[PDB]
A paper describes a structure:
The KCNH family of voltage gated potassium channels includes the EAG (ether-a-go-go) channels, the ERG (eag related gene) channels and the ELK (eag like K+) channels; these channels have roles in cardiac repolarization, neuronal excitability, cell differentiation and tumor growth. A defining characteristic of KCNH channels is their large N- and C-terminal cytoplasmic regions. The N-terminus typically includes a Per-Arnt-Sim (PAS) domain, while the C-terminal region includes a domain that strongly resembles cyclic nucleotide binding domains, but which has been shown to have little affinity for cyclic nucleotides.
While the body of the domain in the Δ9-hERG PAS is identical to the full-length PAS structure, with a main-chain atom rmsd of 0.74 Å (residues 26–135), the N-terminus adopts a new conformation, with residues 13 to 22 forming a helix that packs against the hydrophobic patch on the domain. Some of the amino acid side-chains in this N-terminal helix are not well defined in the electron-density; similarly, two residues (E23 and G24) in the linker connecting the helix to the first β-strand of the domain are not defined and it is therefore not possible to determine if the N-terminal helix packs against its own domain or is swapped with a neighbor in the crystal lattice. Interestingly, a superposition of the dELK structure with the Δ9-hERG PAS domain through residues in their β-sheet reveals that the N-terminal helices occupy the same relative positions at the center of the hydrophobic patch of each domain. Our crystal structures of the dELK and Δ9-hERG PAS domains and the previously reported NMR structures of the hERG PAS domain have clearly established that a stretch of the N-terminus in KCNH channels forms an amphipathic α-helix. Interestingly, the crystal structures show a conformation, with the helix packed against the hydrophobic patch on the β-sheet, which is different from the one in the NMR structures. In the LOV-HTH DNA binding protein the N-terminal helix packs on the β-sheet, side-by-side with the C-terminal DNA binding domain, and in the LOV2 domain of the blue light sensor phototropin 1 a small N-terminal helical extension packs against the sheet together with a long C-terminal helix. It is therefore conceivable that in some functional state of the full-length channel the N-terminal helix of PAS adopts the conformation seen in the structures of dELK and Δ9-hERG PAS.
Residue numbers in the entry: 13 to 22, 25 to 133
C-alpha cells in the first residue's frame, strides 16, 4: 500500500486519487474535504471516473471537460477551471489541478486531482 504514502499528501485540501491502470481512471480515494466540498459522501464518490462527470450540470463547459480528459491522457500537471455542481444543486467555479503520479520507468500509474473554489 504505497497509496497511503501518496495519501500522506492530505490545510482544507480537497482531492481525489485515481487509478490510471484501469480504462476510466476510477477514483480509489477521496479525502473528507472533497466529499464536504461537493456534498457527496465517500461511498457516493468512490469508483467513479475521476473526471467527476457526476458534478456536471448546465454551466459545465464541454471544452473545460475536454481539457481535463486530455490531461488524463498526458503526463504533465494541468490546471483547468470548470463549473461544478454539489449534490444540493448549487454551482461552484472550480480550479482543478491534475497531477500525474509515475513509476520508476516514468509511466503514469495514478493521478491526484485537487479542487479549489474560484471567485
Amino acid at each position: 500500500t504505497f497509496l497511503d504514502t501518496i495519501i500522506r499528501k492530505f490545510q482544507s485540501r480537497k482531492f481525489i486519487i485515481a487509478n490510471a491502470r484501469v480504462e476510466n481512471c476510477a477514483v480509489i480515494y477521496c479525502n473528507d474535504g472533497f466529499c464536504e466540498l461537493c456534498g457527496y459522501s465517500r461511498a457516493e464518490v468512490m469508483q467513479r471516473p475521476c473526471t467527476c462527470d457526476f458534478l456536471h450540470g448546465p454551466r459545465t463547459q464541454r471544452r473545460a471537460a475536454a481539457q481535463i480528459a486530455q490531461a488524463l491522457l498526458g503526463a504533465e500537471e494541468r490546471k483547468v477551471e470548470i463549473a461544478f455542481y454539489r449534490k444540493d444543486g448549487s454551482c461552484f467555479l472550480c480550479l482543478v489541478d491534475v497531477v500525474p503520479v509515475k513509476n520508476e520507468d516514468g509511466a503514469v500509474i495514478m493521478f491526484i486531482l485537487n479542487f479549489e473554489v474560484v471567485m
